[PDB]
Amino acid sequence: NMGLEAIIRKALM
Amino acid sequence: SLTEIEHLVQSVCKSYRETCQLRLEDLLRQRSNIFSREEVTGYQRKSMWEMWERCAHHLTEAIQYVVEFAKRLSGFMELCQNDQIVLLKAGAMEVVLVRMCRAYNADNRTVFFEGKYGGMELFRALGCSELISSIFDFSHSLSALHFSEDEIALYTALVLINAHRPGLQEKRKVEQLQYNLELAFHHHLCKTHRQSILAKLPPAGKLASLCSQHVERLQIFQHLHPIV
Ligand SMILES: CC(=O)N1C[C@H](C(=O)Nc2ccc(C)cc2C)[C@@H](c2nnc([C@H]3C[C@@H](CC(C)C)C3)n2C2CC2)C1
């Protein structure tokens, strides 16, 4: 899901 | 060696405890703090949007903790950025649902929410009775199994570290990490006489996917609703 991806990208970096 | 496996188990547990929001002792202690009927009606009268806004903010908050969990895992940071993301996309929400059984109290069928426990009725404003009810049943089933902290830590590690996710670049590296985790977890299950528990697990894929969809629906339509 793209919504989930946005949260994850930010959290990683 | 046997000692090497044990290093892995303690390490995974360390990282899981480090990235839980509240220590399990704290969750159990606060089971006594229970929302009064008036506080329940407080939540029930809120607008659909307001309730989903709060719920999604907490769904999001939990996912971020799951990302921290992955960071602290042994080989995870060594994987390429693409893989790190693929695995988190596919598994983070499922981890969130597993971690949720910790905050559910089976005695009275109530759950930790914003400082106090309350029942299923607390979420009437969300409107999705079938979905909410299913999330409760899922947590109820997991609680019945009496997963220990160590079991949750290792199992959730395996939910993330899955080598069959579409889109992985370095499949072999991920197999290496998954296999070591299956080794450590299998050893731990043997010593504790708990080998059969993973057979009893309820299925989490459909549920986590619905939660992810609701989280996304709110981000997409934020301009249509009040500033937050
Ligand atoms: C210790 C701690 O920091 N928290 C514990 C909370 C908890 O897991 N509660 C809970 C458990 C089981 C069940 C069945 C329901 C709930 C609400 C955790 C929390 N608060 N809020 C939510 C969303 C989940 C969503 C509710 C769902 C009915 C849509 C709101 N969540 C979970 C983490 C995503 C914060």
Tokens for B224, please give them.
């249509």
Tokens for B108, please give them.
């009275």
| A11 min Cα distance to partner chain B (Å) | 6
Contacts of B156 (CB under 8 A, 6+ apart): B16, B69, B95, B98, B99
Contacts of B96 (CB under 8 A, 6+ apart): B59, B62, B63, B66, B208, B211
Cβ B154 vs Cβ B181: under 8 Å:
yes
DSSP B183: H
Q: Reported resolution in A?
A: 2.6
Using alpha carbons only, give the angle B141, B29, B145 rounded to the nearest 5 degrees: 20
Structural domains of chain B ordered from first start: 1-228 (1.10.565.10)
Pocket probe for ligand 1: among B48, B58, B108, the residue whose CB has the most ligand atoms within 8 Å is B58
For chain B, the residues whose C-beta falls within 8 A of a C-beta of chain A are 60, 63-64, 67-68, 71, 81, 84-85, 88-89, 92-93, 209, 212-213, 215-217, 219-220
